[PDB]
Amino acid sequence: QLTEEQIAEFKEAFSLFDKDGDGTITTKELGTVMRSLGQNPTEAELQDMINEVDADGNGTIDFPEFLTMMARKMKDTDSEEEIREAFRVFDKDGNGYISAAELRHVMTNLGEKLTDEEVDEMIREADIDGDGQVNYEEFVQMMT
């Protein structure tokens, strides 16, 4: 079950999308973050993404709705789809390898400014075969 800290991490995530801190995530705000993650969703795509979470159908996602969804996916430790999705967020050029630049880009988006050494260290931490990049197998092990 959700702990005090868990809700804290989920609030951090929610705030990343709720830029104006009005308590709700709009398709406009989701689009802004998706484009910052290397995606380019159409309005129809964004509407579908909001819909899956917008339990009461008012067209936006509030914290309770966000928490419900995030808590549910976290309980599915057997699911790998979320890890595959995260991998794609990192792997912007779709070549199956997360490069140092690709990893830095995501971290920068999260508001974490890392030095080149920190980035190389983050890569190294998951880079089992030492080729300088993180493939999917390496990414999973890192996440699990």
């Binding site: 989920f10 951090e12 995530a13 999308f17 995606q39 979470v53 995030m70 999705e85 967020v89």
Partner: peptide, 18 residues
Amino acid sequence: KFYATFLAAEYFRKFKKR
């Protein structure tokens, strides 16, 4: 991609750890 973004932050936290 809501949860994916959370996981990205997870990759970071774990790093900041040990």
